């Protein structure tokens, strides 16, 4: 039944946790590759070693 | 969710969706879901799920 | 637009002008309204400053039409509908200001005197080409739909 | 890398900005549009067959 | 579809918009103008003409569906009316500023409850139980094609406006209250109105 | 630079001064025939950029579909700052990001 | 002053009320009729024989040994009928006055402006042996849908 989908309370707290604590990663990358200070290499190119 | 190698395109514009800005190159808009499908999915997050 | 062939030549631009025949490099139908006189021609296309990158690619364009060279012939290099016919300049001629007055952009205006609005829409289409092959934007797409 | 640049197409992709054409009359001619110019006067000094 | 004639009426004359030649040198640029793709014309501050023909739409005195475009890229206004069109009813915002300090909803819960004054209909005439047929007479809800999007910036939920709305003056968030649900994108990017 | 020439505004092409020794270009429709302005031609040009100032933003104020900045508008004066970057085709023109005020319009850059 | 997510339902429930599904369908051809089609026979109405405007007429039958009763579908259909009314454009030979001549059959969309039901009444649509829920959108061409 559904129970079986429905994770713990206090141990999904520390799910939404990780997940939000992963903005901060984003955070300093989406402003931190505005500053050219990435890079890129290899394949290329500079933006596409940003999607990566 | 992705597409062809590439987290949700952009087009039309310089946007993934008419409810985001210009350049948003995050995961808030484009291709990412943070919820399950328990609470669970958000209508700007929606759709990029089907389409992908 | 065509840019192969590194032997032939320097990057030249045509046009075609349904429903017959073939191709027909551009000064040819400005010449062909009433821009025969150069320079006016690029200003309805791009405009200096300019530039000249975007321009120049015109070099190649206009050398063909380096025998034109006024109203005359213009029309003339326009025999060839068809199912064999004509005999022949005269014809020709008429046939020509049919073809502007219908098919060359046939929206717009399909009256007789408005061949100086469909003077400029070229200089427009051929203004998006330029910024392309230069690089300077991208390919509309055709997804939409929208 | 000794090997890794010794199997390369190379040619002429250094330039890539590239060629251009100035007329200049007598062998003694130039002008710019920056400095070099100096270098050149210094080869022609050397009148070690100039004239051939 | 809707006639493309009329619609020029409310260009050549207005205004100025002037047509026939004026290329060399200035004018460009000097912006253009196509209506279905008929660039008769080279107006100059668009300013002005947009934001009094979007009213034309609100007002009903043009057919709603009519699109517009602001390509500030790419210059240009075109403007299409030719059947074929999609649309997508929207609410608006409306922001001058000038009334409400800055925004924000378009609607008001008078205008609802006055809704429901018709759902007990029928029971008068025409009048016309104003539902919906109305909403657009009264510049509450526009038409939005799908090239206007483009130009345009939506919405989610209202609950989203108003927290934008909170924060152009700095207003707590309260993200320790909500219980399990649609995790939104918070706050809001940027993104001023 | 090459241009047309009075008369008949026409193309203009290049032609030495042999004797004298000097630039000079001409047409091949009549026969004017005007001094040289630099010693420069024709160029190349493999590709670097072609933007510079892109002149200007100057429809970026009134794009409701764009992001701003806050306070900080180098010159003129006031806050709020709308903002965007390039990205044609291919690159990698990196993300020389600009900026344009709303009661102005100074393209103030930023590293 | 606020506004909550259960006011916008009752906001779209209007939509549904006047607008309806299939609405453009329906109305695409509620517009044709008159409509635009008047000025197209005019484009070419030239002949070394002019045509006119066009008398609007409602979809009947006729038949041998019968006489000319309008259609009531969908008591027709099953008659394998199909639903057309019959055009007259006004043609110009000169004797003054036009001439009414008819011209083919143009097959016409239930439930539209011209339209056998359009405002017609849910406790009248069932005297007719029809259904409230239909939404028009479809031709009766031959009998079948
Ligand atoms: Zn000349
Ligand atoms: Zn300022």
Redesign the interface.
């Given at each position: 039944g559904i129970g079986d989908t429905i994770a713990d309370a206090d141990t999904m707290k520390e799910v939404?946790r990780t997940v939000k604590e992963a903005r901060r990663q984003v955070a300093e990358c989406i402003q931190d590759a505005q500053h050219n200070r990435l890079k890129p290499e290899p394949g290329m190119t500079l933006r596409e070693s940003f999607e990566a | 969710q992705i597409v062809e190698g590439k987290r949700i395109p952009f087009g039309?514009?310089y946007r993934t969706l008419?409810?985001?800005?210009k350049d948003?190159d995050?995961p808030?808009?484009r291709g990412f879901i943070?919820?399950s499908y328990?609470?669970?999915?958000?209508?700007?997050?929606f759709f990029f799920h089907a389409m992908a | 637009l065509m840019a192969r062939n590194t032997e032939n030549s320097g990057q030249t631009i045509r046009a075609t002008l349904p429903y017959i025949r073939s191709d027909i490099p551009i000064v040819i139908v400005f010449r062909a309204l009433g821009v025969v006189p150069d320079r006016?021609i690029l200003?309805?296309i791009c405009?200096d400053p300019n530039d000249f990158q975007m321009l120049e690619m015109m070099k190649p364009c206009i050398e063909e039409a380096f025998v034109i060279q006024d109203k005359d012939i213009a029309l003339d290099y326009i025999g060839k509908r068809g199912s064999t016919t004509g005999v022949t300049r005269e014809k020709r001629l008429r046939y020509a200001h049919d073809i502007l007055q219908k098919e060359l952009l046939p929206?717009?205006t399909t009256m007789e005197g408005f061949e100086?609005?469909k003077a400029?829409?070229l200089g427009?289409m051929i203004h998006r080409m330029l910024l392309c092959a230069l690089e300077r934007?991208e390919p509309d797409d055709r997804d939409?739909?929208? | 890398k000794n090997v890794q640049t010794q199997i390369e197409h190379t040619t002429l992709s250094t330039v890539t900005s590239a060629t251009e054409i100035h007329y200049d009359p007598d062998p003694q001619d130039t002008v710019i549009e920056e400095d070099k110019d100096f270098v050149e006067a210094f080869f022609a000094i050397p009148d070690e067959e100039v004239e051939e | 579809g809707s006639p493309s004639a009329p619609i020029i009426e409310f260009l050549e004359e207005w205004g100025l918009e002037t047509l026939?030649?004026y290329?060399?040198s200035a004018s460009?640029?000097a912006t253009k103008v196509f209506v279905?793709?008929?660039?008769?014309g080279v107006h100059r501050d668009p300013?002005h003409l947009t934001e009094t023909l979007r009213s034309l739409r609100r007002r009903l005195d043009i057919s709603a569906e009519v699109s517009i475009v602001?390509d500030?890229?790419?210059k240009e206004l075109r403007l299409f009316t030719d059947?074929g069109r999609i649309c997508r009813?929207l609410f608006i915002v409306d922001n001058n500023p000038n009334s409400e300090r800055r925004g924000e909803?378009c609607?008001?819960?008078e205008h609802?409850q006055q809704?429901?004054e018709?759902?007990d209909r029928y029971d008068i005439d025409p009048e016309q139980r104003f539902?919906?047929?109305a909403?657009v007479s009264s510049g509450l809800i526009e038409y939005l094609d799908?090239?206007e999007?483009?130009?345009?910036?939506?919405?989610?939920?209202?609950e989203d406006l108003?927290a934008s709305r909170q924060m152009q003056a700095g207003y707590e968030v309260k993200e320790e209250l909500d219980p399990?649900?649609?995790?939104?994108?918070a706050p809001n990017?940027?993104?001023?109105? | 630079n090459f241009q047309y020439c009075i008369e008949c505004n026409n193309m203009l092409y290049p032609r030495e001064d042999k004797v004298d020794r000097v630039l000079r270009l001409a047409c091949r429709n009549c026969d004017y025939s005007e001094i040289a302005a630099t010693s420069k031609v024709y160029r190349h040009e493999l590709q670097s950029s072609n933007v510079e100032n892109t002149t200007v933003?100057?429809?970026?104020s009134?794009?409701?579909?764009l992001?701003?900045?806050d306070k900080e508008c180098p010159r003129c004066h006031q806050h709020?700052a709308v903002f965007y970057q390039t990205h044609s085709r291919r690159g990698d023109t990196m993300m020389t990001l600009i900026y344009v005020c709303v009661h102005c319009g100074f393209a103030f850059e930023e590293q | 002053?606020?506004?909550?997510?259960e006011?916008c339902w009752?906001?779209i429930?209007?939509?549904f009320?006047?607008?309806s599904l299939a609405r453009q369908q329906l109305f695409?051809f509620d517009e044709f009729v008159q409509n635009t089609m008047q000025e197209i026979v005019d484009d070419d109405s030239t002949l070394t024989i002019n045509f006119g405007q066009i008398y609007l007429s409602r979809p009947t039958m006729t038949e041998a040994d019968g006489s000319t009763t309008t259609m009531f579908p969908q008591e027709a259909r099953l008659r394998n009928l199909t639903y057309s009314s019959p055009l007259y454009v006004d043609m110009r030979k000169e004797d003054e006055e036009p001439s009414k001549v008819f011209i083919g059959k143009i097959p016409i969309m239930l439930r539209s402006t011209f339209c056998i039901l359009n405002g017609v009444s849910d406790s009248e649509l069932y005297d007719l042996n029809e259904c409230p829920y239909d939404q028009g959108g479809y031709f009766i061409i031959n009998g079948s849908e």
């Open positions: 939404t | 039309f514009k008419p409810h985001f800005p948003d995050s808030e808009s943070e919820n328990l609470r669970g999915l958000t209508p700007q997050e | 006016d200003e309805h405009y929206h717009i100086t609005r400029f829409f427009y934007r939409h739909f929208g | - | 026939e030649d290329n060399p460009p640029n279905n793709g008929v660039w008769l300013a602001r500030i890229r790419e059947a009813p909803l609607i008001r819960k609802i809704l429901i018709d759902k539902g919906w047929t909403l799908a090239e999007e483009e130009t345009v910036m939506i919405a989610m939920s209202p108003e399990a649900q649609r995790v939104k994108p990017p940027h993104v001023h109105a | 933003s100057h429809d970026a009134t794009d409701p579909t992001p701003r900045s709020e | 002053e606020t506004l909550t997510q006011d009752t906001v429930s209007s939509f009320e006047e607008t695409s």
